[PDB]
Design a protein around this ligand. Structure first.
Ligand SMILES: C[C@H](C(=O)N[C@H](CO)c1cccc(N2CCN(C)CC2)n1)N1Cc2ccc(-c3nc(NC4CCOCC4)ncc3Cl)cc2C1=O
Length: 346
């Protein structure tokens, strides 16, 4: 068993020459030479089985990424685990190796307007496919966008992804939420469980804004501060948009705030392309019902150099989970992970 930073990384006989890349709560990631395809790959060692929420993330990632096939979505190339459920403590997921991610890039590099345009195009292209499968990614952010040395982009981490469910989207005011705070749509804090495609469009808007200036647009320090950052730029919602929020706690919170006018995008982003700011405005619309959809965004003048709907493929059918995963015990989720990964056993 090869070891990396005091941890077993047992991926042989196919994968050798391991080099450490990083780690986090999820586990650990290495590059490795793949002796079958003869190319270096990324391998992440996930050890989720003592934690129900980690099992859910692992299973969603595996089921979705194995069904999806798209140039702007990271694939799963192979999964290594023990031959029996008893002996399985870890799952190793093999994926195409990427140079960097957009979080690291925005901390270190100015993006040209052409780079911003091309990155936004690829995000929206991959998202068109995801949405066409009736799936919501639900956690789009710079660190979930991987890039190679020629700036090809792939969406990663489907651990919070789910099937769209607009009929069950309504909730009360200040309902707790899991996905990354700075990229949450305003309606999450007011009346939405984040079960519709419009949630993802908001996140992409936030990402576009961040590419424009290298700084997050709405860096909320805690749950309600996130909403207050959004309203600081968008200004007070209009009467029509406010009347859409029928829950009185949420409506009356909004009515309690002093009037704030919209901060023009060209004041926040004085060097930005005007067409980019027009698309930004449409992605960062307060009212999710008025928010631009993914296929409309691709058709926007800002992306005219790239737009080609015949080359923006959709999924062959809607994605469905067999059963709802949200509440299943971790022991049951382990079984499901075992079954989902069986096809990679020799
Ligand atoms: C978290 C998520 C993940 O695996 N998540 C899983 C399912 O959700 C998971 C399982 C259980 C828990 C959990 N948590 C814990 C709680 N936490 C709040 C959220 C995450 N997450 N990661 C980690 C990860 C590491 C590397 C790469 C990757 N990197 C490169 N190159 C490098 C080169 C240097 O520059 C940056 C790029 N090339 C290809 C790839 Cl594939 C991708 C991912 C990915 O998707």
């Amino acid at each position: 068993p090869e070891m990396v930073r005091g941890q077993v990384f047992d991926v042989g006989p196919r994968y050798t020459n391991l080099s450490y890349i990083g780690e986090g709560a999820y586990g650990m990631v290495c590059s490795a030479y793949d002796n079958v395809n003869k190319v270096r790959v990324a391998i992440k060692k996930i050890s989720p089985f003592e934690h129900q929420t980690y099992c859910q993330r692992t299973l969603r990632e595996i089921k979705i990424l194995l069904r999806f096939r798209h140039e702007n979505i990271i694939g799963i190339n192979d999964i290594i685990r023990a031959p029996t459920i008893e002996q399985m403590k870890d799952v190793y997921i093999v994926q195409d190796l990427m140079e960097t991610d957009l979080y690291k890039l925005l901390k270190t590099q100015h993006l040209s307007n052409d780079h911003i345009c091309y990155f936004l195009y690829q995000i929206l292209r991959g998202l068109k496919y995801i949405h066409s499968a009736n799936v919501l990614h639900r956690d789009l952010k710079p660190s979930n966008l991987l890039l190679n040395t020629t700036c090809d982009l792939k969406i990663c981490d489907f651990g919070l992804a789910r099937v769209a469910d607009p009929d069950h989207d309504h909730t009360g005011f200040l309902t707790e939420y899991v996905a990354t705070r700075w990229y949450r749509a305003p309606e999450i804090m007011l009346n939405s469980k984040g079960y519709t495609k419009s949630i993802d469009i908001w996140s992409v808007g936030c990402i576009l804004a961040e590419m424009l200036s290298n700084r997050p647009i709405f860096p909320g320090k805690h749950y309600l501060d996130q909403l207050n950052h959004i309203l600081g730029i968008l200004g007070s919602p209009s009467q029509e948009d406010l009347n859409c929020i029928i829950n009185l706690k949420a409506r009356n919170y909004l009515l309690s705030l002093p009037h704030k006018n919209k901060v023009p995008w060209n004041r926040l982003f004085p060097n930005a392309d005007s067409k980019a700011l027009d698309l930004l405005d449409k992605m960062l619309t307060f009212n999710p019902h008025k928010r631009i959809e993914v296929e409309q965004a691709l058709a926007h003048p800002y992306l005219e150099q790239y737009y080609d709907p015949s080359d923006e493929p959709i999924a062959e059918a809607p994605f469905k989970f067999d059963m709802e995963l949200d509440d299943l015990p971790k022991e049951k989720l382990k079984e499901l992970i075992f079954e989902e990964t069986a096809r990679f056993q020799p």
